[PDB]
Amino acid sequence: DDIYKAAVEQLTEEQKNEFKAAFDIFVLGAEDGCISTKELGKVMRMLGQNPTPEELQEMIDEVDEDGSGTVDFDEFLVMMVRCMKDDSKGKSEEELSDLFRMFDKNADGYIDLDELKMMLQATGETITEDDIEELMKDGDKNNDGRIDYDEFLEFMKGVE
Amino acid sequence: TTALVCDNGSGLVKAGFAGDDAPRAVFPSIVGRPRHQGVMVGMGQKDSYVGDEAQSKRGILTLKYPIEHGIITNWDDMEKIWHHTFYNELRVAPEEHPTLLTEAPLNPKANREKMTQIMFETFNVPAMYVAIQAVLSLYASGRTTGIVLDSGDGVTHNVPIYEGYALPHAIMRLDLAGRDLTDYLMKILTERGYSFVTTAEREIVRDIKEKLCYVALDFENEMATAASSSSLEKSYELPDGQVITIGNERFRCPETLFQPSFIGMESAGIHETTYNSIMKCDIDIRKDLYANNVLSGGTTMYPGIADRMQKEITALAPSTMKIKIIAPPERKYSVWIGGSILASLSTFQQMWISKQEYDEAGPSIVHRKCF
Amino acid sequence: TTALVCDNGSGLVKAGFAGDDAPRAVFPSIVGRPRHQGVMVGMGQKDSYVGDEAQSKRGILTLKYPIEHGIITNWDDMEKIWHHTFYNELRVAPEEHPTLLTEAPLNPKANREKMTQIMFETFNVPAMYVAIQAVLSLYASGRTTGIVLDSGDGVTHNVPIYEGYALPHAIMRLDLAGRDLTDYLMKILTERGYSFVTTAEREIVRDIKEKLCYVALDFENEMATAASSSSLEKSYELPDGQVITIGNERFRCPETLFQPSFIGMESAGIHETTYNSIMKCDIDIRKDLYANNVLSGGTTMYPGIADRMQKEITALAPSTMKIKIIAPPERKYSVWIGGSILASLSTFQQMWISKQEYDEAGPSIVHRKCF
Amino acid sequence: ISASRKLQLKTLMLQIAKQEMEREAEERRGEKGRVLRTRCQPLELDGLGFEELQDLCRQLHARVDKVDEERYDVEAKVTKNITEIADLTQKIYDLRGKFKRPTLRRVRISADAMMQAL
Amino acid sequence: GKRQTEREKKKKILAERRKALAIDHLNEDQLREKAKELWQSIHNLEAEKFDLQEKFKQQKYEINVLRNRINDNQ
Ligand SMILES: Nc1ncnc2c1ncn2[C@@H]1O[C@H](COP(=O)(O)OP(=O)(O)O)[C@@H](O)[C@H]1O
Ligand SMILES: Nc1ncnc2c1ncn2[C@@H]1O[C@H](COP(=O)(O)OP(=O)(O)O)[C@@H](O)[C@H]1O
Ligand SMILES: [Mg+2]
Ligand SMILES: [Mg+2]
């Protein structure tokens, strides 16, 4: 998302103090101002913060579509400050339950790959190959063709 | 709408909607309160596990059947079993479905009246009807005559029927059934060293009886063979290891059916109460009853009983008559299949005990014309 | 407010606020009066150093544990230890915090009643609750079944639990624990020339036991190997130099757990009292207890015990059952982590023994419904 | 495995499903209004006699009694459904507590806070 | 039990709900307005009862879902 400006103007000093401490630790001279994410991860790890390290590494392998390799302030700083849990409200459990019920045209207690595919056709989302297997891992936590509203909730909870 | 064909039984409750081939939900009828203290807090421990749930937590429960011999001895537990059957195993509210219970012959009236009063007041069904457990088993065979021996788990009864006209003076009800065979097997297993005492271990002995025991074609020859060779000793693995070996206890447990003197009962076996039930009938329908002897009920599933019984009756009966024993492979659910067929009939649709009729005459309506 | 999860133990007092991962302050429970005369004036010499302060001045003190085997033998010293724990290691006045003590199974009643009377009269807490030390260790593992062997430093007890229902008739409490292993190690070290006698040098022998001893997978093979090669002799530096070399004393000290005949105790080892505790349980929950054997307590931290115990039980148990031994890396504080989890529960919030209840029924309230 | 694209797809699925539910509930409201108009027929009394009013009051009493009895039954059903919902919610909460509550705690709540002052 | 108590509550509801019935005693406009009001009230009652039917059906489906869940716990 493009919440980069929203993030930089939204951060609380409780985490901005650590952000400025890491700014001092990283930027100490002979800095281009881009601030390499590679050293950023190590510095934040040394700071005692506890994010998930591997996901940011995969993102660095993937994010920055322009292929700079050293992400500018916005995206890498967002991933850094992801230690602050400012999510998209997590929606509501009742809303998602109603959604799952609306999808449950089969009325079998679960929504399978076919109903999800029909929903994607309705919204017109791009054909993705992560399908089926994403339902198998998230929805079919028991591998039985059954997915309740908890797997649906945890599938895209707090998506931003 | 569709009718609910429930069948209380004694040992397994079988239920399902009318018009199908097999009962939808079959589960033991046991209600077991926990007996130990319980230290984990917030574990969500209930006060009584009923049905098939108490066959998995039976290690810390005290299972107790609510139906002793056909009759019902503990009405609160039976009400709990019915409530479970309706709401959790079928998930259909009883306010919108007729029910067809089943009852053994020659049972106390108060049992039947209390059953109908419960069904009409607590569960509030639209209409219920009570049928004798043997006529249904005769329906399922597609016959219209024949003498049916319905050896359930609670009580063994033998109702002869001809051309649709039941003979009320020839019903021979005997109280030896599967439960007494389980107790006798549990009592003779002690001759090798295996002691089962707890009410939970009665289930293990029942499993042993189901999986290993068989009815011997000739008793003395089998007793002599098992005492010389060792070709009969079949082993079985308990729920924790320590396999056991059953010797001549295999065919001695179900032999009690043909010699009730083993468990101290005076009466004659199921091979001779059928012949007595036939001989009480009129002299002109004995050939048809001889030719259409029907077996039903769970306990008649022992491997090799349809031959032992035929041999015994052929020994008793006159040499000219042909003795034939109908033993369908779907013996266990024969009563329920017959119940489904009966509930699916159009001619039967006006025999239900409608609720307004009960409101006008009280629970004693069941003994009246609506039988 | 927050609850204080204290855990008296015997050897290390572990305390901390409810809802954390590790105890805030862990320190030995010893109170040592000075024994020499003392000539410097105005040095500020106190009359009793408790806790971790007396492990640094132990050269001129006579340390004496106030808890012998689970039970408390010296109430004044225990009161002093509690006062230190509340005021100096946590710095929270007890007037504003509930407390959750822990107690071994099968302990004398008077000990528990005196404990609650002290907590309510001297420290004047709002509400306190006493819990069995094994149920907490089962909480910490995140299970709800399993048989937990909590081999502390005072007493080793083995409480089996199924589905949250504790089995009070299958608790096997044995009084061999870490302290007896320390004494036996101190007694077998004399076979090389090293004599430790003073109550201060018992701490040095304890450190030797912690850092060097390990449990042998097979005892006879290790005894044969240590008697031929010299690959086992590990050296250790005393608090003043003069390094010592421990030979086959390394695996002979903790072997006492599996052969209590070494220290003259009659009973069977911790490998066989677990199997006996299982066999007293019902026949249908033995598989689950076999598969979920839990280890806890400090003394179960010997390198290589989770394999020796599994080998022994697999030898004893039937060949079909799977034997699994849960040995979490946070074994030492397992009881306290479980205590924190239990105190943090909402369902448990109404089980505390409120002070007004104690005022109405006296100290004997603890044996009542509020257990 | 893309992430930003995954986030966009999930949030757009949420928004589209919400819009579909809103339009479907609007359709349901329209169908309910149609059913109400049919079964509870619209009543016009412009330039009609008083015997019409008497018949209307009679039919009103009859239909009020029958609908109140039916809604009494439906309310009994709703109360039973609410009781079942509360019980099953309690049971699911107990299951989630058994599976997850022991894992819910404040780890390093103060342990990491105090490092070297001692 | 569970047959007259509920019957008694329903009877009481009918008694309190069915007001006094008197028509030919009054002017035509007043009775016409009152009858229209009662018709609209009972029509709104029908609407509410139908919404309750749909909601309780959905909650019954959710109860089936929770039944499947507790079945998955064993
Ligand atoms: N395959 C089997 N072999 C031998 N005995 C069986 C078998 N199945 C069931 N039984 C016995 O029959 C009993 C079940 O009988 P059932 O027909 O269910 O009684 P009911 O008439 O009460 O339904 C069980 O208790 C068991 O002892
Ligand atoms: N790492 C270790 N290796 C071997 N033994 C240990 C180790 N840590 C502690 N012990 C033994 O365990 C005892 C501490 O046990 P603990 O669990 O604190 O007892 P309590 O149940 O009273 O808290 C010490 O006396 C020591 O003998
Ligand atoms: Mg039967
Ligand atoms: Mg302990």
Short mmCIF file of C-alpha atoms in Angstrom, two decimals, chain B residues 41-44 46 83 87 95-96, chain D residues 73 77 84 90-91 94-95 97-98:
data_model
loop_
_atom_site.label_atom_id
_atom_site.label_comp_id
_atom_site.label_asym_id
_atom_site.label_seq_id
_atom_site.Cartn_x
_atom_site.Cartn_y
_atom_site.Cartn_z
CA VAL B 41 -9.87 -25.56 35.83
CA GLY B 42 -11.74 -24.30 32.80
CA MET B 43 -11.33 -27.57 30.92
CA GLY B 44 -15.03 -27.43 30.08
CA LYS B 46 -19.61 -31.57 31.55
CA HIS B 83 -32.85 -35.26 23.77
CA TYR B 87 -30.87 -32.51 18.74
CA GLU B 95 -41.85 -29.96 16.90
CA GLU B 96 -42.17 -30.73 13.18
CA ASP D 73 -43.87 -20.01 18.49
CA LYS D 77 -37.63 -20.90 18.43
CA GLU D 84 -27.90 -22.82 21.71
CA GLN D 90 -19.07 -21.11 25.37
CA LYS D 91 -17.97 -24.54 24.13
CA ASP D 94 -13.44 -23.54 26.00
CA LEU D 95 -11.90 -25.41 23.06
CA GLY D 97 -8.75 -21.96 25.67
CA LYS D 98 -7.63 -25.58 25.82
#
